[PDB]
Design an enzyme around this catalytic site. Structure first.
Site, PDB file in Angstrom:
ATOM      1  N   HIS B  71       0.822  -1.208   0.000  1.00  0.00           N
ATOM      2  CA  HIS B  71       0.000   0.000   0.000  1.00  0.00           C
ATOM      3  C   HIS B  71       0.871   1.281   0.000  1.00  0.00           C
ATOM      4  O   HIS B  71       0.430   2.337  -0.443  1.00  0.00           O
ATOM      5  CB  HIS B  71      -1.051  -0.038   1.115  1.00  0.00           C
ATOM      6  CG  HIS B  71      -0.517   0.285   2.474  1.00  0.00           C
ATOM      7  ND1 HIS B  71      -0.401  -0.659   3.473  1.00  0.00           N
ATOM      8  CD2 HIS B  71      -0.104   1.457   3.016  1.00  0.00           C
ATOM      9  CE1 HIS B  71       0.077  -0.086   4.564  1.00  0.00           C
ATOM     10  NE2 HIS B  71       0.273   1.195   4.309  1.00  0.00           N
ATOM     11  N   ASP B  95       0.056  -7.670   1.373  1.00  0.00           N
ATOM     12  CA  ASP B  95       0.467  -6.269   1.444  1.00  0.00           C
ATOM     13  C   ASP B  95       1.978  -6.169   1.648  1.00  0.00           C
ATOM     14  O   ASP B  95       2.462  -5.332   2.422  1.00  0.00           O
ATOM     15  CB  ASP B  95      -0.261  -5.559   2.595  1.00  0.00           C
ATOM     16  CG  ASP B  95      -0.199  -4.049   2.493  1.00  0.00           C
ATOM     17  OD1 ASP B  95      -0.532  -3.383   3.492  1.00  0.00           O
ATOM     18  OD2 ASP B  95       0.183  -3.506   1.435  1.00  0.00           O
ATOM     19  N   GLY B 151       3.063   6.897   9.089  1.00  0.00           N
ATOM     20  CA  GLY B 151       4.317   6.756   8.370  1.00  0.00           C
ATOM     21  C   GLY B 151       5.209   5.626   8.857  1.00  0.00           C
ATOM     22  O   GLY B 151       6.376   5.520   8.449  1.00  0.00           O
ATOM     23  N   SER B 153       4.414   2.376   8.481  1.00  0.00           N
ATOM     24  CA  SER B 153       4.259   1.191   7.644  1.00  0.00           C
ATOM     25  C   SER B 153       5.653   0.668   7.294  1.00  0.00           C
ATOM     26  O   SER B 153       6.528   1.440   6.887  1.00  0.00           O
ATOM     27  CB  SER B 153       3.506   1.542   6.361  1.00  0.00           C
ATOM     28  OG  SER B 153       2.193   1.976   6.666  1.00  0.00           O
TER      29      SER B 153
END
Ligand SMILES: [Zn+2]
Ligand SMILES: [Zn+2]
Lengths: 645, 645
Positions: B71, B95, B151, B153
RNA sequence: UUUUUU
């Protein structure tokens, strides 16, 4: 960096006003052109799309001047064909700045027809029907979500002939829907052009025959708070000097005695000295606690550091401006080294040196070389108490005489002699006078902002942001005082000075209710005086809204208020009031965070959903919106709220 | 553009787990490096800070591979010392994406100790205690606002021994407060690495011995919808071919009858034909209205255009997947030219020319040179109907044969021969067949997204966004088909393919209730089969939440629902349901926008504040939150909502 | 903006 033109909106010739846009610069080009201030692109049209590092808005050319908003552009230069163009006009009061229009730019002609059918041009080249209502206001024929107007500040309001009526600056919203617009009228640009760009406020104003408010703009160390009042006193005047800092205020006593042979009165929370001398030093807080101006006591009131945007200084200065004349003063001096719009210029005592990634001590993504701070006396500014504690513990681990300083701690923790690396938040500035061989600055600040989030009411948010020009100047100014200093920094920029957030207005009402026994209506009168006074920091006018909110907060629990007051954290009144409503509803707080410690005594008895009034932090418990106060505050949210887009 | 390493997080090598950040590149270097794809900086550490143009997040190296989230990174290359590094693994289902780790990168060792005490490292080098609770879930010891995990991820979760347990991909929130985190566990990295790097789905799947779901990834023009099902039929199988569009489905039928000698059954709203033939063509929508899979009817079901993320397709494919095996199918084929993770690649017959600011025709900030469309046949994609009308109007008024096409219009308005310039929305994709000498693409499109705004409940908003790779490749594919073609574009990038918003799930429940007589429970079963199937577009799992909302929306007014269904706008159930509540309260709708047109004749009778259930547009009227349905939906908002940060 | 079931 410079503001950069990254596109334009082309207006139609005649017959039905239309517009379309052109994007002439990408992201890479914008960043580059911002850094160099050198833009060789040819300028066309009367409306430019301009951009900074982080924001994009519009600029409109009228009378050979390219105009936009101070809140977007600050004091920034505009990138030009031969380098950065310095602003020719800066009017923080009107939220207006202008650069000499570059060649190739065409101007609109100021409107003279008096038409009330206006047309706002947005940053997406939409043309929106507006009905003029005031000199500075117009209603939208079709209300739109405020987000539709984002980035349109600096855009023109046109009459049906296509003449400039003014530039857009803010949206007037009802529950987030823009129903009207606020604009800077052309008449204001004219007025700005024909004011003298150079007003000298460097000398102490003369005492006038009738009451005046005057500005004193003079560099730090020029004696605004010592030499100046002592001069006045010599001429037989009685002078009150107000200052935000207790440490600074106390310090004036000893300095005035030896430097000017006056033993002034001193007024602070921690210590009061009455000598009967004709000069008095007070903090703004003590001034407010004392009830403001006592009639006949002073001829001159100097509001020192009048650029300060903490609630106490703002409320205290507003009190002076509302009360001075009637209390018999003839002169109010608003004194500062950094008035709104000011920028940080090089200092001869101070060598400025960017940090790099070379160094043994990690610091905000960069590194500090140990040799830079081993030996000597150094000050390192961090944004938070936690980062201070950490860095001090680490430096201490390398046998570096390091101490952490911040709100809560006593200044005695700082050794006034011998090597030391002090790691502090901005609390240093009000709690400790004194300089260092070097300053290292994270260049960020923790700040509070209001969000009219309607979930259910408003939210006071805390965020970490890039420092502004006042912060930079004041942190830097802790070195290079009668000595050669070094200033090391993470980032080179600085945000524009002289603006503050609506949440500070909220803090003023809170303090009025909590500390100074002021009704919301009385707080408004004082804040209105502040807001009506040119040359001071500016803020969105949300006085009627905040007054409305606090007016509804009746019969607070005196006991909880005592506890939040004593505990010393922000918004003691709002925190105590939420706690009061909870306890009376026999429900728990929004959370069991420390903000709500005054409720622990009742923890076992409080159950069910929180009757939430507003959000002052994270809400972990479940919420009910049934309380009458919650409904009252929700009702207050329907008021016109002017916000920048 | 590439993903660029712009900093790193340095982890403690011993004792307690700690971290600090090093910033190795500013915004300028980032943008430059992203464009070139070449980054010569030495790379160090296990955790990298990575950015594109619009976002920044983390990447963690495990087993010689630099891993991050799909993503965030999409299918982007990583800037490397000798140029852009292409991804070695792209697992949209999990993901997870991975590049072969550059030289200098160290790797975290996989955790095999089973410790349930975890530590999450944030993009700001914070180390957060987390209690493991599942294979892919962990609870925060101290819940924090979701904004805090922004932020992060791709950041690692570490066990006490500093081993990698997984990477952070999303927060699980209770009313916006992160109480737990979702992560991609190291075991998924392991399984990813142990499956082939390349796979071929280019050939029609063989019919398997036992029920199988299979994928067909083959280019447009390859005969996915015609040649493939014909060949299956020639092998003696009964085939059902499902396609999103009526036009497409009718087109295939007609073609199959002449070019493959068989008269297929056809099922669409406007035209249903039973021929008894072995091949049937149907829309997903008709298939749904038919009640889904009919026992024993089909050996093979081809879900054509299976990348489509419109609600009818998703619900229809979910229905196929839940029902097919029990209905006797041997094989489900998920067919598309552009599966999740795919990118638009250079095409021999297509020269791609960037629009500049040079041209007589303004187009989305750039311009179209009149000599690029004056002679010949060309196609122009705009994001809205307005733009289509306005550009057609201008072009024709300049002597160019211009025609506007979009949803609602008669397709015939498009000249099938002779010079023309067609200005169209995406309706052209299904609605009209045929090539053009060139395509000019605005590169944006209109989408809906949900915000869990709690003001009081949720908000569905419509915005204009940059197109994704499916959009780009589809618009571009209208030229260069067998002949030479030109593709002209406003912008050069593309957002990653294969993801859709939770708002689409909402639309599925809406259509379930409005059109297909599905209880929310039944809709959840079909959607779960879709979400549990590998290789399809992916979405946040909010099935329980949406089911709970619609479950409470009982006793809708049939008349309002009949009208919202007939008017063809989105969320006919939610709109008619809000109307129902208003009408029964004699209260006005949220606004008098066309969305609420079914209430127009009752207007004179409606007074007071809107009992607001959710936000589907601007709300102009005052609101009350006292209605029981409002209270019920507010309670639904307390469910675990997993969201990316 | 697309798309569908009446
Ligand atoms: Zn005029
Ligand atoms: Zn382990």
């Amino acid at each position: 960096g410079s503001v950069v033109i990254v596109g334009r909106i082309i207006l139609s010739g005649s017959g039905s006003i239309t517009a379309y846009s052109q994007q002439t610069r990408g992201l890479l080009g914008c960043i580059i052109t911002s850094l160099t201030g050198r833009d060789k692109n040819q300028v066309e049209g009367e409306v430019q799309v301009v951009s900074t590092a982080t924001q994009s808005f519009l600029a409109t050319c009228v009378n050979g001047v390219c105009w936009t908003v101070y809140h977007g552009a600050g004091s920034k230069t505009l990138a030009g064909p031969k380098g950065p163009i310095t602003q020719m006009y800066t009017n923080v009061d009107q939220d207006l700045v202008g650069w000499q229009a570059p060649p190739g730019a065409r101007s609109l002609t100021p409107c003279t027809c008096g038409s009330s059918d206006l047309y706002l041009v947005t940053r997406h080249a939409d043309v929106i029907p507006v009905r003029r209502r005031g000199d500075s206001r117009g209603s939208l024929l079709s209300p739109r979500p405020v987000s539709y107007l984002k980035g349109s500040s600096g855009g023109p309001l046109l009459c049906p002939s296509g003449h400039a009526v003014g530039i857009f600056r803010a949206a007037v919203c009802t529950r987030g829907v823009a129903k009207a617009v606020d604009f800077v009228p052309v008449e204001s640009m004219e007025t700005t052009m024909r004011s003298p760009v150079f007003t000298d406020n460097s000398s102490p104003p003369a005492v006038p025959q009738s009451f005046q408010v005057a500005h004193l703009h003079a560099p730090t160390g020029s004696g605004k708070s010592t030499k100046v009042p002592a001069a006045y006193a010599a001429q037989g005047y009685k002078v009150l000097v107000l200052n935000p800092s207790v440490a600074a205020t106390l310090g004036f006593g000893a300095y005035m005695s030896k430097a000017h042979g006056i033993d002034p009165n001193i007024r602070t929370g921690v210590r009061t000295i009455t000598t009967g001398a004709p000069v008095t030093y007070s903090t703004y807080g003590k001034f407010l606690a004392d009830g403001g101006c006592s009639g006949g006591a002073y001829d001159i009131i100097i509001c020192d550091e009048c650029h300060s945007t903490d609630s106490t200084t703002i409320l205290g200065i507003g009190t002076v401006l509302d009360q001075a004349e009637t209390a018999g003063a003839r002169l109010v001096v608003l004194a500062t080294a950094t008035p709104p719009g000011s920028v940080t210029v090089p200092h001869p005592n101070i060598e400025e040196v960017a940090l790099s990634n070379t160094g043994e001590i990690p610091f905000y993504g960069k590194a500090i070389p140990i040799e830079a701070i081993r030996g000597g006396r150094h000050l390192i500014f961090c944004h938070s108490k936690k980062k201070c504690d950490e860095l001090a513990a680490k430096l201490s681990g390398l046998g570096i005489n390091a101490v952490a300083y911040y709100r809560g701690l006593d200044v005695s923790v700082i050794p006034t002699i011998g090597d030391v690396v002090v790691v502090a938040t901005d609390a240093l500035m009000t709690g400790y006078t004194g300089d260092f061989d070097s300053v290292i600055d994270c260049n960020t600040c923790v700040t509070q902002t209001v969000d009219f989030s309607l979930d259910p009411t408003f939210t006071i948010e805390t965020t970490t942001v890039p420092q502004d020009a006042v912060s930079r100047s004041q942190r830097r100014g802790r070195t290079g005082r009668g000595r050669r200093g070094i200033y090391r920094f993470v980032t080179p920029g600085e945000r524009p000075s002289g603006m503050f957030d609506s949440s500070v207005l909220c803090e003023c009402y809170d303090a009025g209710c909590a500390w100074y026994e002021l009704t919301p209506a009385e707080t408004s009168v004082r804040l209105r005086a502040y807001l009506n006074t040119p040359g001071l920091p500016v803020c969105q006018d949300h006085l009627e809204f905040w007054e409305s909110v606090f007016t509804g907060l009746t019969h607070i629990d005196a006991h909880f208020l005592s506890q939040t007051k004593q505990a010393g954290d922000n918004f003691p009144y709002l925190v105590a009031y939420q706690a009061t409503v909870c306890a009376r509803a026999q429900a728990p707080p929004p959370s069991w965070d420390q903000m709500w410690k005054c409720l622990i005594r009742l923890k076992p008895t409080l159950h069910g959903p929180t009757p939430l009034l507003y959000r002052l932090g994270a809400v972990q418990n479940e919420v009910t919106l049934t309380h009458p106060i919650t409904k009252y505050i929700m009702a207050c949210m329907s008021a016109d709220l002017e916000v920048v887009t």
